[PDB]
Amino acid sequence: DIQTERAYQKQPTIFQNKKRVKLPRYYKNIGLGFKTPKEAIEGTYIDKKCPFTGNVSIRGRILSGVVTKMKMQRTIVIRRDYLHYIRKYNRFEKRHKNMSVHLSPCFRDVQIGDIVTVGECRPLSKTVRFNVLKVTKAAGTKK
């Protein structure tokens, strides 16, 4: 389950140590018009870099990419295909900036090839400046 880690993972707002006689979970809305899922609020996991149930505010640019790797933890590698116009040779070329993105852990089942939504914020880490805001399931996966 959870809290097989060193320091007490908690939300720095809610309480859970009062006299009675299922812990109360704090979330928020994000702006732009995005939906926090059932899985965020039904579950009991504890994370701080989420734009919904954590300390980060989404502002500036909001971009999209396609998921390539999920071998890191709480952060994914997405990829941004675009065409670059060279003025001399009136044609294009494939380039990509596979930007480092934090994996907002409210998204339970994300696969590679899923079109993600990413929002600019303050830097979470050295290269990470983005969070996951929505995910679409693979083309089938019937079994």
């Binding site: 809290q3 007490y8 908690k10 859970q16 140590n17 009062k18 812990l23």
Partner: peptide, 9 residues
């Protein structure tokens, strides 16, 4: 420290 925090530390 109280409750589950006290049953952690």
């Amino acid at each position: 420290l109280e409750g589950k925090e006290l049953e952690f530390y």
